[PDB]
Design a protein around this ligand. Sequence first.
Ligand SMILES: Nc1cccc(Cn2ccc3c4c(N)nc(N)nc4ccc32)c1
Length: 159
Amino acid sequence: MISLIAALAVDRVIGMENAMPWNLPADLAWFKRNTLNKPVIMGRHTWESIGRPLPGRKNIILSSQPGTDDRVTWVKSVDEAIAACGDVPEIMVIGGGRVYEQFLPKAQKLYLTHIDAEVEGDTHFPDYEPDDWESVFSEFHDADAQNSHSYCFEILERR
Ligand SMILES: Nc1cccc(Cn2ccc3c4c(N)nc(N)nc4ccc32)c1
């Protein structure tokens, strides 16, 4: 089954850099744990944003362009991306914006990290009608020395 995992700032703004405010160590650990030993699907910008395949995971890159790295699997369509995962309990879609939009209608689970920050970005996480989604887990954390902003993990399940 298909899950989306994403770090969202206020107004559901999403970005991707090794900088503020999506480089919080605790959001990274959450991300690792929830994607470990699962196939990950991602856009090209997100693939560059990591510069390296994620270990112990099958990495699948959805892009209209041909591939430039043989350590990972390149595909051109949503259904090709899904098939490339094989028979597995959970597929993890890890961004970016356009990829979320494409997989949301087929997703049955959302892993969201709400960061209590504001950053300027045109790229947003797709609007999920809260009538079709049920929150089933929440975990708020205060800012500390390692994590500059407060943050809250949430898991939602499609209703
Ligand atoms: N160095 C590195 C290792 C793993 C991932 C990345 C970039 N990256 C790529 C995706 C993510 C990411 C995500 N999809 N969701 C959440 N909640 N957090 C995330 C944090 C980082 C992400 C960078």
